[PDB]
Amino acid sequence: YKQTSV
Amino acid sequence: PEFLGEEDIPREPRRIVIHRGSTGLGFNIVGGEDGEGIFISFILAGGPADLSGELRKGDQILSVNGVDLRNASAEQAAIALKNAGQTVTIIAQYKPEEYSRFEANSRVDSSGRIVTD
């Protein structure tokens, strides 16, 4: 799992 | 009264064009592991994505500026989005069932809305 702001 | 909340959320792909100059798009993405897809998990109040009014949590990002992201990793997806330039053309498709696997205690109701208990 990976979550990022763009 | 005629409530929007009763109406089904469209499940067809849509084109969204965000003009954000040189600031962040204002949303989060999750996924990217083993071609599972890249999904919007959070839209920032007041950010460019919010101001578009055409993206929501549970949308899958199918492509950005013609670049297919259906099978992207999370990092390369983020790179693609961050480097997409001032005008960002997103093809998105609402996939709440797939999305709901990521967020704790979440499910999809009859209208296709994501509910978290």
Side-chain angles (χ1 to χ4, degrees), chain A residues 1 3-6, chain B residues 1-33 35-100 102-117:
Chain A
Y1 157 79
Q3 175 157 187
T4 314
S5 302
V6 299
Chain B
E2 178 168 293
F3 299 113
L4 286 295
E6 302 201 32
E7 300 162 8
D8 293 342
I9 296 169
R11 281 173 184 265
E12 302 83 7
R14 308 106 54 200
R15 184 183 299 101
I16 298 90
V17 184
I18 297 169
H19 312 278
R20 48 76 173 266
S22 287
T23 188
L25 287 155
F27 65 89
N28 291 11
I29 56 169
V30 296
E33 259 63 70
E36 69 191 347
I38 303 298
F39 304 86
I40 300 182
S41 58
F42 175 96
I43 296 179
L44 177 66
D50 182 26
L51 296 193
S52 84
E54 300 160 37
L55 294 168
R56 73 178 76 225
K57 181 178 79 177
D59 277 339
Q60 186 183 353
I61 306 300
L62 305 184
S63 68
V64 63
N65 294 354
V67 178
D68 179 13
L69 299 182
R70 288 173 307 145
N71 299 107
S73 64
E75 181 179 16
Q76 282 307 310
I79 289 167
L81 288 161
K82 289 178 170 181
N83 290 102
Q86 306 162 87
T87 306
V88 184
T89 299
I90 291 167
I91 308 301
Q93 184 166 30
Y94 187 57
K95 290 281 186 139
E97 294 77 19
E98 282 86 351
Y99 170 80
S100 70
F102 292 102
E103 189 172 359
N105 295 132
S106 303
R107 60 190 168 84
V108 185
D109 75 12
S110 292
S111 67
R113 286 170 168 79
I114 297 155
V115 171
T116 304
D117 301 296

